[PDB]
Description:
Chain A: Residues 1-247 form the Peptidase S1 domain. Chain A: It comes from Homo sapiens (Human). Chain A: Residues 181-203 are annotated as: High affinity receptor-binding region which is also known as the TP508 peptide. The complex is a heterotrimer. By secondary structure, chain A is mainly beta. Chain A has a domain at 15-117 and 245-246: Trypsin-like serine proteases (Thrombin, subunit H, Beta Barrel). Chain A is built from four helices and 16 strands. Chain B has one strand spanning 22-23. Chain C has a single domain, classed as Thrombin light chain domain (Epsilon-Thrombin, Chain L, Irregular), CATH 4.10.140.10. Chain C has one helix spanning 19-25. The complex binds 2-acetamido-2-deoxy-beta-D-glucopyranose and sodium ion. 2-acetamido-2-deoxy-beta-D-glucopyranose (NAG) binds at residues 48, 53, 55 of chain A. The site of sodium ion has 7 residues of chain A, from loops.
Amino acid sequence: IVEGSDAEIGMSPWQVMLFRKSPQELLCGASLISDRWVLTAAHCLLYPPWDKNFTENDLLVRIGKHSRTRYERNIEKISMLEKIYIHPRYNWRENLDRDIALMKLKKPVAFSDYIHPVCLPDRETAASLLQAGYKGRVTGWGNLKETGQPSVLQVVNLPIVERPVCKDSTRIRITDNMFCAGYKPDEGKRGDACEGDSGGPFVMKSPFNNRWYQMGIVSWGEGCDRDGKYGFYTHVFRLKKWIQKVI
Amino acid sequence: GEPGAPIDFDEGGTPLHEIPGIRL
Amino acid sequence: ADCGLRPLFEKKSLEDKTERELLESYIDG
Lengths: 247, 24, 29
Ligand SMILES: *[C@@H]1O[C@H](CO)[C@@H](O)[C@H](O)[C@H]1NC(C)=O
Ligand code: NA
């Protein structure tokens, strides 16, 4: 996260760390959506153009965490993956269309003060919150500057951007399965996800029922926190039918 | 006020990896 | 059923340091 701040303890209890067993390193973010299901981006697990192809036994999930590196005993919970489900029409060849994956934990995780699932949006929620200029929240342990990791989980709040503005900031072909977020050069504030934050949640707090909803998945961007560029997020609601038949 | 993404369900171009500084 | 309500915030009627910024962006003006 660029231009963010430390998260508070318990601020993002759905945040999941996808940790590479060997070599020991942060692979991606993810989110907890049930006691046994974790949501992430498909390209965190599968990206042939960079020879990336991770199976269940390559990865560990670490849930409840705050420190990027310290074992948090009686706070964090480690888990192993039963099965990985990548969207059948995930387009790794071009633009990362349908950048979504689900992961089943080998055993369900007990919830706690630090571990708690995020909601997925309904149609009513998606319609009320997915409006240009409304701010979501992005969290992760990714890099603080373009291409230098934080001590603890970082947080930044970012506005959803009008679709024609998103499409005009990039040469990439943008699909209805993506939205973009970020401040514009003349907005005074800044902030972005960066390397390491991929697959984490873009969440919004409903003013109607006080609950946090995962509206997006950290998918891709051009640089980190560049003027005139914006982060692109998987449009979670539009893919809910696929999320459905997996569980 | 303006929708940032459509509320229906899911039913060429340059590849991301060719963009300089691409963040994945 | 309990999703998205945080034990250390919503369940204790405590706001985090910046969730007001989010709510404030949802109002049009
Ligand atoms: C990725 O998945 C498995 C992992 O072992 C590998 O055998 C397969 O050839 C790979 N396929 C692609 C399209 O990368
Ligand atoms: Na920017």
